Amino acid sequence: SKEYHIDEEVGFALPNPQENLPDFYNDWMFIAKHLPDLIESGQLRERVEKLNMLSIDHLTDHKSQRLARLVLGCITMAYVWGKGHGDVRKVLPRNIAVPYCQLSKKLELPPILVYADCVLANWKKKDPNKPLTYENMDVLFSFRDGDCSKGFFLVSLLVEIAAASAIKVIPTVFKAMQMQERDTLLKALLEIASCLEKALQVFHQIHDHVNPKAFFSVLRIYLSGWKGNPQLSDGLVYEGFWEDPKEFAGGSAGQSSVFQCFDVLLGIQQTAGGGHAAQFLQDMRRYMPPAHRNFLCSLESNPSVREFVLSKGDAGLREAYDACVKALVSLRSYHLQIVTKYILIPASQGGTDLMNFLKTVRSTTEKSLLKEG
């Protein structure tokens, strides 16, 4: 893999994210670093509104630009949703909206908190000389005390990273296919499956660091966007940058290139059709870092692993291939149980389009199995 911005140990996540910005931006940092407080004491909005329009020209490298995106991102969410009880601002102050939109255009991402922001770039290791384990990690920004943002963001991060171990073998896969190296292809496929089976394990941690009510009633609120959202019908107006209000989708792990990449790799057509699920997954790529979406399509232009495995009456291969597909459905099936627990139940103390979306994606994955009939 070339510079598709994919680290060997961390995958799609940003390696060693930047924690501090140039003093020139201390005003931004302060708000971001004290969001839980400012929000609760009800002085957040007033503070954003007192901000001077800062220029983004002093954000020289990528990482510093990403940090910035995170800060302005978190701030924008806090501002729009407030204490997150129903009182929402429909207009984002030009002093903040401008830099944010300019930085966004520069990074080729929409002006709203995105997965690549609050997960991929929102972390740090407590002890630099220790492994990447929950215990040795922390997020950079949170919305409100007890919103379980650490648990959510980090467990996603950790799953993201577990899946990163397979990304590195993708090249091996394609090489083997043209070099007609059957034993190499088989090895590779199983390795991938193994990594996807380990990611599921990592996923279990979600129960240990995220409480259903807190998640459903708080975090979920701040991660909401303004596309097809009843309380922001026509979107959000980025004062001083755009004429009319713009609609954008909230942050969601659905923006992770990880799962999409494997669906591609394995020839699963999540994106095909005119269906609602397909449109959503296709649309979410717009929310992924440009480098990453480039990676996703470069894969799409490679020869099909599925067609290859099928064209070879080789059980070993078919099975190894199914192993990977089986791993995905397993992850998704587990993900459903999780939504049930962290959304369905909490909301019961309409939202079925949710379950049908997920089940359609899952179903599509299953359908790709080879030796099922």
Residue 196 or 206: which CB sits closer to ligand HEM?
206
Binds ligand CYN (CB under 6 A): choice among 102, 217, 252, 304? 252
- Please state the length of the chain: 373
Residue 152 or 321: which CB sits closer to ligand HEM?
152
Which of the listed partners (ligand CYN, ligand HEM, none) does 210 bind, with a CB threshold of 5 to 8 Å by partner kind?
A: ligand HEM
Query: Shortest approach of ligand HEM to residue 316 CB, angstroms?
Result: 28
Residue 242 or 334: which CB sits closer to ligand HEM?
334
Annotated binding site: 335
Rg of the chain in Å (alpha carbons): 21
Pairwise CA distance, residues 268 & 109, whole Å: 26
Binds ligand HEM (CB under 6 A): choice among 44, 101, 159, 185? 159
Query: Shortest approach of ligand CYN to residue 309 CB, angstroms?
Result: 30
Could you say whether residue 344 binds ligand HEM (CB under 6 A)? no
Choices 45-53, 185-193, 239-247, 252-260 (CB under 6 A): range interacting with ligand CYN: 252-260
Burial 89-121, CB ≥16 within 10 A → b, else e: beebbbbbbbbbbebbeebebbbbbbbbbbbbb
Size of the site for ligand HEM (CB under 6 A): 24
Could you say whether residue 336 binds ligand HEM (CB under 6 A)? no
Query: Shortest approach of ligand HEM to residue 201 CB, angstroms?
Result: 12
Could you say whether residue 152 binds ligand HEM (CB under 6 A)? yes
User: How far is CA 201 from each of CA 155, 158, 207, 269, 315, rounded to the nearest angstrom?
Assistant: 11, 10, 12, 26, 27
Pairwise CA distance, residues 105 & 118, whole Å: 18
Site for ligand CYN in 194-223 (CB under 6 A): none
**Tokens 């440009």 sit on residue:** 290
Residue 59 or 284: which CB sits closer to ligand HEM?
284
- E strand or H helix at 124, and its extent? strand 124-125
Binds ligand CYN (CB under 6 A): choice among 253, 336, 355, 358? 253
Residues 6+ apart with CB under 8 A from 234: 244, 245, 247
The interface mask with ligand HEM, positions 174-203, x = CB under 6 A, is -----------------------------x
Which of the listed partners (ligand CYN, ligand HEM, none) does 222 bind, with a CB threshold of 5 to 8 Å by partner kind?
A: none
DSSP, residue by residue, 100-148: HHHHHHHHT--SS--HHHHTTTS-EESSTTS-S-GGGEE-S--SSTTS-
Residue 252 or 302: which CB sits closer to ligand CYN?
252
Binds ligand HEM (CB under 6 A): choice among 88, 190, 310, 339? 339
Identify any residues that bridge with 91 across adjacent strands, giving them in sequence order. Answer: 237
Q: How many CB atoms lie within 10 A of CB 219?
A: 24
Pairwise CA distance, residues 110 & 118, whole Å: 14
Binds ligand HEM (CB under 6 A): choice among 252, 302, 330, 360? 252
Indicate the pairing of strand 124-125 with strand 137-138. Answer: antiparallel
Residue 257: closest CA among 62, 3, 5, 2: 5
SS3 call for 332: helix
Q: What angle do CA 305, 257, 110 make, to 5 degrees?
A: 140
- E strand or H helix at 222, and its extent? helix 220-222
Could you say whether residue 344 binds ligand CYN (CB under 6 A)? no
Could you say whether residue 355 binds ligand CYN (CB under 6 A)? no
Residue 114 or 305: which CB sits closer to ligand CYN?
114
**Tokens 């969410």 sit on residue:** 77
Which of the listed partners (ligand CYN, ligand HEM, none) does 317 bind, with a CB threshold of 5 to 8 Å by partner kind?
A: none
Residues that bind ligand CYN (CB under 6 A): 252-254
Residues that bind ligand HEM (CB under 6 A): 152, 155-156, 159-160, 203, 206, 210, 215, 252-254, 256, 259, 332, 335, 338-339, 342-343, 354, 357-358, 361
